[PDB]
Amino acid sequence: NQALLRILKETEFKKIKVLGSGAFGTVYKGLWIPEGEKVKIPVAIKELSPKANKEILDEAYVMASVDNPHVCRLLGICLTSTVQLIMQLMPFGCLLDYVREHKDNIGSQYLLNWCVQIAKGMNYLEDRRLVHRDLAARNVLVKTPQHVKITDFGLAVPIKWMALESILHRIYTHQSDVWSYGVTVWELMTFGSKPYDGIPASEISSILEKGERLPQPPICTIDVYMIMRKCWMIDADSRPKFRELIIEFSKMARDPQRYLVIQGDERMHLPSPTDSNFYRALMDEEDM
Amino acid sequence: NQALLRILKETEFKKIKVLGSGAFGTVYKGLWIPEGEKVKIPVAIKELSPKANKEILDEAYVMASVDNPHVCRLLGICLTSTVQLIMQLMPFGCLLDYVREHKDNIGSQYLLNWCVQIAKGMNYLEDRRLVHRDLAARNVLVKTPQHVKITDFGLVPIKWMALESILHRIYTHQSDVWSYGVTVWELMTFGSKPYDGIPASEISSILEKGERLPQPPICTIDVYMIMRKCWMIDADSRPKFRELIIEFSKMARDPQRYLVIQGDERMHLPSPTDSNFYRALMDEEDM
Numbered sequence: 001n002q003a004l005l006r007i008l009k010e011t012e013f014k015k016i017k018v019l020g021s022g023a024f025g026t027v028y029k030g031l032w033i034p035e036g037e038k039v040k041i042p043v044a045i046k047e048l049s050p051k052a053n054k055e056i057l058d059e060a061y062v063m064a065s066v067d068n069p070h071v072c073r074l075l076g077i078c079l080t081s082t083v084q085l086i087m088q089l090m091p092f093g094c095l096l097d098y099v100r101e102h103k104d105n106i107g108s109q110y111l112l113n114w115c116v117q118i119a120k121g122m123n124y125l126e127d128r129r130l131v132h133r134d135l136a137a138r139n140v141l142v143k144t145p146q147h148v149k150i151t152d153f154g155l156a157v158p159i160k161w162m163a164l165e166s167i168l169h170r171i172y173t174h175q176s177d178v179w180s181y182g183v184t185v186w187e188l189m190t191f192g193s194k195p196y197d198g199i200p201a202s203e204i205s206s207i208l209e210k211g212e213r214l215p216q217p218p219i220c221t222i223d224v225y226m227i228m229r230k231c232w233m234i235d236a237d238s239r240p241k242f243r244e245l246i247i248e249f250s251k252m253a254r255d256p257q258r259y260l261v262i263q264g265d266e267r268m269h270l271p272s273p274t275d276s277n278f279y280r281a282l283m284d285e286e287d288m
Numbered sequence: 289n290q291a292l293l294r295i296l297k298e299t300e301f302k303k304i305k306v307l308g309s310g311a312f313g314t315v316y317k318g319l320w321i322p323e324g325e326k327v328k329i330p331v332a333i334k335e336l337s338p339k340a341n342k343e344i345l346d347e348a349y350v351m352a353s354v355d356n357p358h359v360c361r362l363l364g365i366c367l368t369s370t371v372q373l374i375m376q377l378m379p380f381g382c383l384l385d386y387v388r389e390h391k392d393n394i395g396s397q398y399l400l401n402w403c404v405q406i407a408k409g410m411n412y413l414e415d416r417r418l419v420h421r422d423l424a425a426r427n428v429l430v431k432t433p434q435h436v437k438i439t440d441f442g443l444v445p446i447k448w449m450a451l452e453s454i455l456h457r458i459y460t461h462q463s464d465v466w467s468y469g470v471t472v473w474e475l476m477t478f479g480s481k482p483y484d485g486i487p488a489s490e491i492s493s494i495l496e497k498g499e500r501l502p503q504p505p506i507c508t509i510d511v512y513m514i515m516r517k518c519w520m521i522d523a524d525s526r527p528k529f530r531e532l533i534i535e536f537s538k539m540a541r542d543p544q545r546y547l548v549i550q551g552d553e554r555m556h557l558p559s560p561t562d563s564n565f566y567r568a569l570m571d572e573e574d575m
């Protein structure tokens with residue numbers, strides 16, 4: 001249990017470049033320096049009282065306790081005046097920046113597989129009875145282009161991702177996560193657009209109650225959009241379950257050009273197996 | 289089958305720092321840059337005719353076909369003006385240099401486990417009917433200090449070779465058992481050169497005479513006997529790699545009984561907490 005979180009010394013790691021900031025502190029690219037040998041092992045570091053460190057560690061053990069190919073795991077923690085958490089570094093960044101930088105080279109087969117993977121991770125957090133509460137394209141990281149992992153879940157401002165019962169009553173279930181999943185797909189199919197951009201956060205809840213939703217993205221057939229819209233029903237139990245979303249986006253992944261309409265789709269396909277095995281033996285040695 | 293070897297272009301990778309040479313060419317630390325992507329992936333590259341390249345690929349497909357935690361796999365080839373082969377980069381280098389540089393903190397539990405691992409990989413190559421022909425501490429790479437892998441198999445190292453290889457260029461798996469015994473000895477002497485100071489032309493005469501490498505001081509007689517049975521003159525009398533796994537595993541369950549190193553009770557394996565950290569950053573594979 002508690003053997004999954006390694007307690008780190010300030011002396012055995014070093015922040016070296018800033019990647020960004022987020023939900024409790026700033027993220028840096030770092031290096032781990034194993035005691036007694038000289039090898040710089042790249043990591044990611046989030047820089048956030050003694051008793052609050054017991055609240056921190058009690059949750060840290062929870063996030064250090066996950067095991068699923070599509071969920072990120074917390075690997076270490078360093079108790080300093082400001083706390084420092086350490087996870088494996090994903091050289092491909094998050095999917096949000098990814099989809100906004102290759103938006104003219106992403107084919108339909110990747111997009112739908114990203115949806116499958118995110119539903120796989122989410123359904124796993126559901127099976128662990130863990131609620132994400134901040135699911136969003138920024139919180140989906142890219143291990144290899146064929147392989148994404150969800151991050152920074154379970155931390156108890158993202159109003160434009162929140163289900164209506166979270167905006168009005170701070171109710172966070174897995175069914176409220178399904179709603180934010182619905183927005184996350186929408187970030188993907190639109191190659192990184194800011195949902196409800198320019199309509200004040202203060203006024204989102206009145207527009208959802210009124211019955212407006214995010215608009216059908218251009219590359220989406222009705223079949224994909226109808227699933228997004230069912231994720232945004234006002235009644236939580238009517239939204240689909242993640243286990244269903246897995247089956248549905250997997251079906252759509254067996255025939256992608258039927259469900260997403262992208263210009264140039266026939267000139268960009270999956271990696272050959274040759275290319276996936278190469279990617280995996282260099283970068284991605286875990287199970288799936 | 290051939291989807292296990294990725295055919296690379298010169299333009300999608302770059303050698304960046306020279307790591308060493310020895311076997312068949314020069315090895316560099318490199319970078320692979322995925323087509324259409326902005327990330328730079330560390331790799332290892334060995335830089336060496338069109339017809340000879342068919343001899344090459346036929347072997348390369350085999351060396352790309354291994355799947356065992358303790359055997360290295362060939363990952364790509366770039367058959368251009370100079371043949372360039374690509375495998376995963378092992379940031380810890382080869383085991384020989386490891387044992388030479390960390391001779392101050394290597395305990396008996398590490399040594400004995402390396403033997404178990406080297407026998408595991410070797411016994412797998414046997415099962416695949418591939419003869420190493422060059423098993424040696426230099427050809428044992430370090431993925432993590434807890435995890436070694438055999439490399440550059442399937443391809444003169446006179447001081448490692450079984451006698452029937454010196455006398456008849458005969459290489460079977462039983463000849464690999466011998467080089468295995470010599471590999472252990474390099475490890476237990478913390479990296480000494482076997483038959484140091486003796487000209488290569490004369491090793492065969494000393495082996496036929498019946499001398500062997502001498503018992504290292506840190507080695508109990510139980511360990512020495514295994515090294516000696518690896519060096520019997522009748523190849524079929526030497527032990528099998530499957531047998532060496534069991535025996536060195538038996539010895540690892542009680543390491544200080546079988547190796548006598550000063551300061552040994554102050555260096556132990558990593559805690560599980562430390563093994564899990566090691567594995568999620570560096571070693572995510574099965575074992």
Ligand SMILES: CN1CCC(c2ccc(-c3ccc4c(c3)C(=O)N([C@@H](C(=O)Nc3nccs3)c3cc(F)ccc3O)C4)cc2)CC1
Pocket residue numbers: 023024027044045046052055056057059060063072073074075085086087151152153154155156
């Ligand atoms: C509200 N009042 C205020 C202060 C007190 C408090 C209580 C708990 C935390 C806590 C505990 C644990 C985590 C986090 C926060 C968090 O931000 N965590 C991420 C994570 O670390 N990300 C990373 N990026 C790069 C390197 S580390 C994360 C990583 C992961 F691998 C999986 C899930 C996850 O959430 C983990 C902080 C403060 C309590 C009460």
Ligand SMILES: CN1CCC(c2ccc(-c3ccc4c(c3)C(=O)N([C@@H](C(=O)Nc3nccs3)c3cc(F)ccc3O)C4)cc2)CC1
Pocket residue numbers: 311312315316332333334336340343344345347348351360361362363371373374375439440441442443
């Ligand atoms: C006599 N005339 C002269 C010339 C012709 C010829 C024939 C075959 C080769 C050949 C082919 C393939 C390999 C090797 C050599 C080799 O040296 N290889 C190692 C390996 O790649 N090392 C590495 N270090 C860092 C990056 S690549 C290796 C790596 C691995 F992961 C597993 C096994 C293995 O053998 C692979 C070259 C030339 C033929 C006839």
Ligand SMILES: */C=C\C(=O)Nc1cc(Nc2nccc(-c3cn(C)c4ccccc34)n2)c(OC)cc1N(C)CCN(C)C
Pocket residue numbers: 019020021022023027044087088089090091092093094095096097137138139141151152
């Ligand atoms: C969508 C934001 C983002 O994550 N961008 C990003 C991420 C990484 N890698 C990485 N690995 C582990 C943890 C994190 C991480 C977690 N949180 C809350 C972050 C906030 C901001 C930044 C990173 C966070 N990230 C990365 O590695 C190279 C780069 C990157 N960016 C800014 C894109 C640059 N290209 C080189 C990818």
Ligand SMILES: */C=C\C(=O)Nc1cc(Nc2nccc(-c3cn(C)c4ccccc34)n2)c(OC)cc1N(C)CCN(C)C
Pocket residue numbers: 307308309310311315317332375376377378379380381382383384385426427429439440
């Ligand atoms: C024994 C020398 C050596 O390998 N040193 C070494 C190796 C690596 N990584 C690496 N990865 C894959 C394959 C090889 C490799 C295999 N063979 C037969 C080689 C011969 C010559 C060179 C490399 C070979 N090696 C490495 O990665 C950073 C570093 C390294 N060095 C330079 C050790 C010295 N410092 C680590 C202290």
